[PDB]
Ligand binder design. Structure first.
Ligand SMILES: O=C(O)C(F)(F)C(F)(F)C(F)(F)C(F)(F)C(F)(F)C(F)(F)C(F)(F)F
Ligand SMILES: O=C(O)C(F)(F)C(F)(F)C(F)(F)C(F)(F)C(F)(F)C(F)(F)C(F)(F)F
Lengths: 114, 114, 114, 114
């Protein structure tokens, strides 16, 4: 799997379970094609989110539904979503991990690329 | 002015000057209308980005062109853009400051709401 | 004043008021001399923390009592304290601002150096 | 192993290899007892850093030598070290992971506690 996510909760000190997200690929005319969706497990991950055939070179957007996560926790969130947009160059089985650290009014995101 | 930004550079310890951004409001059908553009000054700020008349409650997006910023700093960036998407509740002259801390492969964003 | 702080609360989207801190300079033998204390105001700042006369070049530590802050907010914290330790090069009226973004199990710290 | 670390590099988008650190336990009179040291591998980790017998309930400090890491990379760092101080309650094989995201003038740290 060339695309992994890891989400943590900065209020409780746990991975962020049950976060919904969607992966889209940018189209020529500027639109977006949905290619996968999922919900993180209790470790804040989605295993085998997409396949290598689904992940050609191009621009991708991963949209994380952080608002619902905080609503469930009882907190009042600021953001509607966390968005991560990047150009993928997957040749050579290059792998992408998107890490995300959530607070109700803040998030930190980083990427680890092999 | 109800919407401010403050952008900092985590590599060199200075505000991020000359960062372009676009502000959009979400429409009822789920699309986006651009309502303003600007470029940060050398303090990492944009004064008078929008007016209170342009800022009813709703969903807003600020798109920061961080890729062009890192290219101009001379460091290869990961993100194609940094998008901050948030719910506005201006009732009562509430002001919003979007703070953004930039590194080539990471950013932290938070908000200060008066 | 050559040393400023700005503390924000990532849970509620406001400055962190009433955060106690202690400033120390490192001695030649590797110990620490306390040179100032303060408490943040409701803007998350401490004015006139030290003077230029108290700020030669060297190694400084700012110890932020974040555990007492989170206890008073009513959220269980992870860290016993947040310590920021840095090299000062004041030659030329260089000013230092320590920015600190707090969550119960995380913090982000950066600096803006004039 | 009850204590793990994970260090990432926000400039290059890789784990932070070859970072030296030391683990100390707080003493009654306020001092510190060194209990382990190590250097991260290429995945930004130190496997089996300490044993459960070495990790009684108490306050611990993990000091990461970030200055040397940035000097090696050619960057000019702000901080001397990154310090993480916390009270450990290891009963029930409770585990602690200290995560750390480094930039030359900034770091984010968080903890995951099982
Ligand atoms: O699970 C892991 O080992 C991990 F992916 F490396 C990570 F620990 F989650 C992490 F990416 F390092 C991290 F914790 F998320 C972080 F340090 F990057 C962070 F916390 F700062 C951020 F905010 F990015 F999530
Ligand atoms: O300039 C200011 O007064 C400010 F907006 F408060 C700020 F200092 F930039 C800040 F927001 F606090 C901050 F520095 F950006 C931060 F601390 F929040 C940060 F650095 F951690 C983050 F990464 F969020 F920008």
């Amino acid at each position: 799997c060339p695309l992994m996510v890891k989400i943590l909760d900065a209020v409780k000190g746990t991975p962020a379970g049950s976060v919904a997200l969607k992966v889209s690929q940018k189209t020529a005319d500027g639109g977006w094609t949905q290619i996968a969706t999922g919900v993180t497990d209790a470790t804040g991950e989605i295993h085998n989110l997409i396949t290598e055939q689904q992940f050609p070179a191009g621009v991708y957007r991963v949209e994380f539904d952080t608002k619902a996560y905080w609503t469930n926790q009882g907190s009042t969130p600021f953001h509607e979503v966390a968005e991560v947009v990047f150009d993928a160059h997957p040749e050579g089985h290059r792998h992408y991990t998107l890490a995300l650290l959530l607070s109700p009014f803040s998030y930190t995101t980083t990427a680890v690329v092999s």
